[PDB]
Amino acid sequence: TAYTPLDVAQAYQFPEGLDGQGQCIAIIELGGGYDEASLAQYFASLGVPAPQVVSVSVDGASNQPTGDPSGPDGEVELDIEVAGALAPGAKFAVYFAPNTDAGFLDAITTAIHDPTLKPSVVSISWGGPEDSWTSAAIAAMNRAFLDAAALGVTVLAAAGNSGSTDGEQDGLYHVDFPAASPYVLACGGTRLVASGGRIAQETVWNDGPDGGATGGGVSRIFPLPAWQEHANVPPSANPGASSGRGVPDLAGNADPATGYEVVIDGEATVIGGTSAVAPLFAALVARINQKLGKAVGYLNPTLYQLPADVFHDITEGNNDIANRAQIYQAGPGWDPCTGLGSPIGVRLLQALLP
Ligand SMILES: [Ca+2]
């Protein structure tokens, strides 16, 4: 199975008649590049306008396609194609920076404060284990996300593509950063079976140690935020582990088995990962912003107080690819695999109306 981003948009009942006009979405990139022409042929294929796309150099980096679909280029054009196909009225701003703690931070700080392009949304599909960041990088990134909240900018981050261990091989469970920041909308991954615009099945993305799985779990760095106190977040599964920020907040189709029809470095292919879900929801927020005539900005506190039927609950599966422990497991309501679940577009919009 495969979908266009349009197909996934329909299954999650994105509100129609909104193309993100008047919004600018920033996408953070730490490598590779796009060709603003291959993007144009791709969008044309979907029958949707090619949106405007501008690149921004950060810390000496720039838009440099490496030619390898398996490399950074894959993330870059996945991010622009999925969000661009769903919010084609919006302006895209692609900030390139070196793949390190400091250029990642500098990229994020730049997009957020950018007085020229002024994005109202920031989609992020890069990260690493929260315990692998420097302390000063941690704090700086959180100050930046704090700034985003003050400026009414929604920051979305992919929760990770390597299950509850997050690519770590030390035998412990770990959460990815920046998805672990409380100030980011952490995006989890599911397997979606949909048709006729109805969700037939939706479960945790888990394709074992070889096919990847959605990240998710409990932070051992950030404490359980005030607004997550009623979402029955467990302690981290690691021995001795306290209460922390539960990851993620929402989730969407991520399973390459049921992935995204994309065009990467001129080749037609089907991709997955939570890498796709932040751009997907970045387009949804932009449609909502256009509808409300105002930027919704930091959403985390509102989402966990909204009625449950705003979301499609995932209840089945786990994101454990390290062992047979099923840590963590999906369940009723919030869980450390899919958070609140997949958002239902028209209902989210409705719930935020004045
Ligand atoms: Ca659930």
From Swiss-Prot:
Q: Which cofactor does it need?
A: Ca(2+)
pH-activity note = Optimum pH is 3.9 (for degradation of azocoll). Stable at pH 3.5 to 5.0.
- How activity is regulated? Partially inhibited by L-alanyl-L-alanyl-L-phenylalanyl-chloromethane, leupeptin, 1 mM Fe(2+) or 1 mM Hg(2+). Insensitive to specific inhibitors of aspartic proteinases, such as pepstatin and diazoacetyl-DL-norleucine methyl ester (DAN), to specific inhibitors of metalloproteinases (EDTA), cysteine proteinases (N-ethylmaleimide) and serine proteinases (PMSF).
Q: Which UniProt keywords apply?
A: Calcium, Hydrolase, Metal-binding, Protease, Secreted, Serine protease, Zymogen
- Name all Peptidase S53 domain ranges: 2-354
What terms describe the molecular function in GO for this protein? Answer: metal ion binding; serine-type endopeptidase activity; tripeptidyl-peptidase activity
State what changing E75H does.
Can be very slowly converted during the acid treatment into a mature form. Almost loss of activity with IQF as substrate. Exists as an equilibrated mixture of nicked and intact forms of the precursor and retains very low activity
Induction, as annotated: Constitutively expressed.
A single GO BP term for this record reads: proteolysis
Reported modifications of this chain: Autocatalytically processed.
| Cofactor binding, per record | Binds 1 Ca(2+) ion per subunit.
Identify the residues that bind Ca(2+): D313, I314, G331, G333, D335
Report the active site residues.
E75 (charge relay system), D79 (charge relay system), S275 (charge relay system)
Q: How does activity depend on temperature?
A: Optimum temperature is 60 degrees Celsius (for degradation of azocoll).
Taken from the UniProt entry, a GO cellular component term is: extracellular region
Q: What class of enzyme is it?
A: hydrolase
Where is this protein found? Secreted
Q: How does it assemble?
A: Monomer.
Report the protein's function.
Answer: Thermostable pepstatin-insensitive serine-carboxyl proteinase. Can specifically and efficiently degrade collagen. In vitro, preferentially cleaves the bovine collagen alpha-1 chain at a single specific cleavage site. Can also hydrolyze the chromogenic substrate azocoll and synthetic peptides derived from collagen. Also shows low activity with albumin and casein, but cannot use keratin azure and elastin.
Any further remarks? Kumamolisin-As does not make a specific three-quarters/one-quarter cut of the triple-helical, native collagen, characteristic for the previously described collagenases.
The protein depicted here goes by the name Kumamolisin-As
**Organism of origin:** Alicyclobacillus sendaiensis
